[PDB]
Design a protein around this ligand. Structure first.
Ligand SMILES: [Mg+2]
Ligand SMILES: [Mg+2]
Ligand SMILES: [Mg+2]
Ligand SMILES: [Mg+2]
Ligand SMILES: [Mg+2]
Ligand SMILES: [Mg+2]
Ligand SMILES: [Mg+2]
Ligand SMILES: [Mg+2]
Ligand SMILES: [Mg+2]
Ligand SMILES: [Mg+2]
Ligand SMILES: [Mg+2]
Ligand SMILES: [Mg+2]
Ligand SMILES: [Mg+2]
Ligand SMILES: [Mg+2]
Ligand SMILES: [Mg+2]
Ligand SMILES: [Mg+2]
Ligand SMILES: [Mg+2]
Ligand SMILES: [Mg+2]
Ligand SMILES: [Mg+2]
Ligand SMILES: [Mg+2]
Lengths: 127, 58, 171, 222, 51, 159, 185
RNA sequence: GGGUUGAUAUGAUGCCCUGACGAGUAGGCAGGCGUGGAGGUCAGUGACGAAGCCUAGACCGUAAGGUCGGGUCGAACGGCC
RNA sequence: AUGAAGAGCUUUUAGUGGGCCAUUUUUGGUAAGCAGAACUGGCGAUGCGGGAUGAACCGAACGUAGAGUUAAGGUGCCGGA
């Protein structure tokens, strides 16, 4: 159902991890640039981690697209969902985390009626 | 504790970054330092010349 | 490289004081015409008041051997700069062409005297047309009647790295 | 305003005339080149017959290639390379031979390889790596309309007339060669021939005047 | 959108040059020369063969 | 101690000449300098009045003023990253006309003459100078000029 | 690599898209960039560039300046264009019947120009009356008349208004300003 | 550096075309991410489970970070200007 | 002659004001990986291939990737040839 798109290319599927997030627990994995005068990572010696830069950017045709080819749009109710009535081949709905189980039923029913794809049609389902 | 006294190292690179431009040349340069005995006459001569052209194409 | 012989003819540039200058000539052993013309001026600067800016080249021509299959005996007169000073040499080379003789001479000088192309000058190469004018025994040795000699201890080169029999040096 | 037939046909007719003109001009240029070669050949022959020597005309055109990278260049060579538009390794430019340019070349000799190009390599360069400076942009030529629009002032209509203004160094060589973007050449496909580049071609290297051996190198690089 | 190289792609070759059609028709890349009966003088040959 | 005075390092520069000491010939004083004239500066050491600083030796400038015994010259002086204009009041013994301007103006009037001469028939003067071109083809004869073969000479001491 | 002759990735150094967030000015820009794109007239480009300018590069233009400009020859029946504001000037006692196009008019300027029989015009009505700049006369105001320019280039022997809050005797009128006290500059 | 307001549809800071370029400490500038609180709005989420916490489970983004699922929990909390 | 990559102009402000190395010129000193100057180029601020190893030497300067060709240096094995 998705709109035709090219092969999706990423150029770096590996998460850029902070230097020594593997060595110290106080050092979190969220990327920080090394600003040190003698940093091997800042100086880009062979054999060190890679630094994020703009050349790794994704093609503007395939940016923000999930592997299904849809752009994700968060919804909390049927009125927010109905904005994607005429955009089913481009945008897929994601029900927000804080939505209740009984309202997820309504959102999923209306999305099935309108032909809208839902990325998480299994949250808070009992059986 | 001695130190380095003087070197002209890097000064040509620095100057030529935005450098050795000629200052510039204008038409009608300054009459500054020119002889006052000449300036005093040039004033009157220019006055008369302006008057003459005015009365000419009046 | 592999050498060639070039006839290079040069001429001080004409003037009103003296047109038609005297058209000097040289034989140059060189791998190409650019090096031939460089060496022409190198030597003509040593002999006469002229340089590439005040002179010109009227013709450069390749000289091929008239008899490339007759086995000649050559004598070569060499000037070479050593590390201490400068020396002269006479060497006898038995070969089939002037260019081959000069190649062999440059190699023998590089080998026995560590002299380089920049250090070597060729004064002249002359075919010894009469035997018994040869004076070097290492050439005179191959000028003997019905000469014949073997090549002992032959080594056959193997395409593989494993041989399944011991080889032989017979010949 | 149907205009899809009448004006289209008029444009096609106007193009037919330009192509006829180009065809006849190119035939003339071929007849000129072949005669210019044959006549100097026969002049050498006749001087040999008469016991004289034929001193061929010194060349009016060289092709210069940058052989050295951009690091560690003194200022005078750096400026001369910028003025010849050789801003990267293996960039090439045609140069008119004059006393004003030979000294430039003597200054930049350890950084370039230059010599005397042939019609074949000039033509191959302009046809494979042929780029024009149109409004400060590097436009592939790919058609004679660009050349007619940007050099039609100077009698030039075709890539062939351009090649002619280059090789038969004409009144408008400056404008043609400036229109031509610096040739962006690859490294030689067979190699440089020597083990070591930064000696003179005479001393076993690669830089300097390799008078007529530059065609081989350039064809390997193009 | 793409630089097609002449010296291959005869179509682009002919787009740039219409003379390329008759160049091949006449085989001007393999033109034969008129034979000549010129012989050098003796001074040239003896100077060349001189020592 | 150090020493940077007005006439420091002028020993050989403000030297007079060999066999040209004494007074100066009268052509220096009979020459005529108008405003706009280009003049080279070469200090005479025998006239201590009106001297230039050693910096302006061998410098060429333009006249901006004329007085009883002196001449006002403008010079361009490199000071760091720029040029500043400098006004000297120099006696004429340290001053001579530059011959470059005379040789340019002769060419000016010659080009004007050529243009007026060849406009009567329209033949495209092409008045611009050009560099020394490459030399054209020619033929060299061996008539009485047979090639003289040469060879490298051996090594001798010559002492 | 490249041996670069110029500085890479350098902005032009010229303003586009005026940084004023005024929507009416943005609309004037939308109109005049279209006209500059399609009319082949230099007037449109001049006006478009002028609409980008800052306040100090858009000085006010006095009606007396406009009167001078119309006292030129062949300029009496012209349309005066001021990319900026027009201010009043009581130092004139007559004003002609011209029409004046400007962004803003002061109340006094508008009243003077109207009382003289003229009309005050906007740059959008100027666009329909004169899309290529027919019979126009662009006036710019004085830029170096500002106070800040007095201090630009302060140094010895320039004569360039030192930066000073309180003026009077004993405020920068001593050593460095008179030979009796050391030196004079 | 240029093209493109034409009516009908969505964004003129938009879309599009063309060419070139891309190292960087100190330092400068720009565009963005995230936190506590304030005004406005989504008649936003929420005891049918908010926030927080854990999760070699998933997705988006060059990254800052954002989103989802599962577990735990119990009362509040977010998106946009 | 060649080239111009836009030319010219102004305002304001940051950091810096310990330097060091190589070729060549040169001063003191027996000399110094010493001290001090001149010109350029570099390190500092710079990773990459090579020099086994190295701030500076050779080569070459860096967005992310693919293919090809090469520089310097190399092709017995370690090691691609
Ligand atoms: Mg950690
Ligand atoms: Mg560091
Ligand atoms: Mg210091
Ligand atoms: Mg190969
Ligand atoms: Mg090599
Ligand atoms: Mg393309
Ligand atoms: Mg003297
Ligand atoms: Mg690059
Ligand atoms: Mg733009
Ligand atoms: Mg920083
Ligand atoms: Mg919860
Ligand atoms: Mg964990
Ligand atoms: Mg409770
Ligand atoms: Mg400062
Ligand atoms: Mg300071
Ligand atoms: Mg530091
Ligand atoms: Mg480096
Ligand atoms: Mg070197
Ligand atoms: Mg590879
Ligand atoms: Mg191997």
């Amino acid at each position: 159902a998705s709109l035709p798109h090219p092969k999706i290319v990423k150029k770096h599927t590996k998460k850029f991890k902070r230097h020594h997030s593997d060595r110290y627990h106080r050092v979190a994995e969220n990327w920080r640039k090394q600003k040190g005068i003698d940093s091997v990572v800042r100086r880009r010696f062979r054999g060190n981690i890679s630094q994020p830069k703009i050349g790794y950017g994704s093609n503007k045709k395939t940016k923000f697209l999930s592997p299904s080819g849809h752009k994700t749009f968060l919804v909390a109710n049927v009125k927010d969902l109905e904005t994607l009535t005429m955009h089913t081949k481009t945008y897929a709905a994601e029900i927000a985390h804080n939505i209740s189980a009984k309202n997820r039923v309504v959102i999923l029913a209306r999305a099935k009626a309108l032909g809208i794809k839902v990325t998480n049609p299994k949250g808070r389902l009992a059986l | 504790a001695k130190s380095k006294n003087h070197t002209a190292h890097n000064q040509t690179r620095k100057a030529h970054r935005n450098g050795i431009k000629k200052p510039k040349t204008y038409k009608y340069p300054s009459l500054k330092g020119v002889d006052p005995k000449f300036r005093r006459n040039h004033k009157h001569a220019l006055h008369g010349t302006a008057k003459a052209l005015a009365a000419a194409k009046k | 490289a592999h050498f060639k012989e070039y006839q290079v003819i040069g001429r001080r540039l004409p003037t009103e004081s003296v047109p038609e200058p005297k058209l000097f000539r040289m034989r140059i052993f060189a791998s190409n015409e650019v090096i031939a013309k460089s060496r022409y001026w190198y030597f003509l600067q040593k002999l006469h008041k002229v340089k590439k800016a005040s002179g010109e080249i009227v013709s450069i021509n390749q000289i091929n051997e008239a008899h490339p299959t007759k086995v000649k005996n050559f004598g070569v007169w060499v000037r070479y700069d050593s590390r201490s000073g400068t020396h002269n040499m006479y060497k006898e080379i038995r070969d089939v062409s002037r260019v081959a003789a000069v190649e062999t001479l440059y190699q023998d000088m590089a080998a026995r005297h560590r002299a380089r192309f920049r250090s070597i000058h060729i004064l002249k190469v002359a075919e010894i047309e009469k035997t018994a004018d040869v004076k070097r025994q290492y050439v005179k040795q191959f000028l003997t009647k019905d000469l014949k000699f073997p090549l002992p201890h032959r080594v056959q080169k193997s395409t593989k790295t494993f041989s399944y029999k011991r080889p032989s040096t017979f010949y | 305003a149907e205009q899809v037939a009448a004006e289209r046909a008029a444009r096609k007719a106007a193009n037919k005339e330009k192509r006829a003109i180009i065809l006849e001009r190119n035939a003339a240029y071929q007849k000129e080149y072949e005669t210019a070669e044959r006549n100097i050949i026969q002049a050498k022959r006749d001087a040999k017959a008469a016991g004289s020597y034929y001193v061929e005309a010194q060349h009016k055109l060289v092709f210069v290639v940058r052989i050295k990278g951009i690091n560690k260049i003194p200022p005078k060579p750096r400026k001369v390379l910028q003025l010849l538009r050789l801003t990267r390794i293996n960039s090439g430019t045609f140069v008119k031979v004059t006393k004003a340019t030979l000294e430039l070349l003597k200054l930049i000799e350890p950084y370039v390889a230059y010599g005397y190009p042939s019609y074949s390599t000039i033509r191959q360069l302009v046809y494979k790596r042929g780029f024009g400076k149109i409004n400060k942009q590097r436009v592939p030529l790919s058609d004679n309309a660009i050349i007619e629009a940007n050099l039609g002032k100077y009698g030039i209509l075709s890539i062939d007339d351009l090649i002619h203004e280059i090789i038969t160094v004409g009144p408008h060589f400056k404008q043609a060669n400036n229109f031509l973007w610096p040739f962006k050449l690859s490294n030689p496909s067979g190699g440089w021939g020597v083990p070591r580049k930064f000696k003179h071609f005479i001393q076993g290297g690669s830089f300097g005047n390799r008078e007529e051996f530059i065609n081989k190198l350039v064809k390997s690089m193009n | 959108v793409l630089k097609k190289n002449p010296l291959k792609n005869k179509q682009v070759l002919l787009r740039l040059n219409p003379y390329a059609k008759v160049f091949a028709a006449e085989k001007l890349g393999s033109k034969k020369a008129e034979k000549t009966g010129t012989k050098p003088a003796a001074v040239f040959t003896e100077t060349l063969k001189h020592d | 101690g150090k020493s940077h005075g007005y006439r420091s390092r002028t020993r050989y520069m403000f030297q007079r000449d060999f066999r040209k000491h004494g007074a100066v010939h009268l052509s220096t004083y009979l020459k005529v300098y108008k405003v706009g004239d280009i003049v080279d500066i070469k200090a005479n050491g025998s006239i201590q009045k009106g001297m230039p600083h050693k910096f302006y030796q061998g410098k060429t400038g333009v006249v901006y003023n004329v007085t009883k015994s002196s001449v006002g010259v403008i010079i361009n002086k490199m000071v760091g990253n720029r040029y500043l204009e400098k006004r000297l009041n120099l006696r004429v013994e340290h001053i001579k006309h530059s011959k470059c301007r005379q040789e340019f103006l002769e060419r000016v009037k010659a080009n004007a003459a050529k243009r007026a001469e060849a406009k009567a028939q329209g033949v495209a003067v092409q008045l611009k100078r050009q560099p020394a071109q490459p030399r054209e083809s020619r033929i060299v004869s061996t008539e009485g000029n047979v090639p003289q073969t040469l060879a490298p000479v051996p090594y001798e001491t010559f002492i | 690599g490249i041996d670069h002759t110029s500085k890479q990735h350098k902005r032009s150094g010229h303003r586009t898209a005026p940084k004023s967030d005024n929507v009416y000015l943005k609309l004037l820009v939308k109109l005049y960039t279209f006209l500059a794109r399609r009319t082949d007239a230099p007037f449109n480009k001049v006006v478009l560039k002028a609409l980008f300018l800052s306040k100090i590069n858009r000085p006010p233009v006095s009606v007396s300046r406009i009167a001078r400009a119309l006292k030129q020859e062949g300029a009496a029946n012209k349309t005066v264009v001021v990319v900026g504001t027009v201010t009043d000037d009581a130092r004139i006692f007559e004003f002609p019947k011209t029409t004046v196009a400007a962004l803003r008019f002061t109340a006094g300027a508008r009243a003077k120009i109207v009382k003289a029989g003229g009309e005050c015009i906007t740059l959008d009505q100027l666009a329909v009356r004169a899309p290529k700049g027919q019979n126009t006369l662009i006036l710019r105001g004085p830029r170096n008349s500002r106070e800040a320019v007095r201090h630009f280039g302060m140094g010895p022997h320039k004569g360039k208004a030192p930066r000073i809050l309180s003026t009077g005797r004993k405020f920068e009128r001593a050593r460095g300003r008179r030979r009796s006290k050391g030196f004079k500059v």
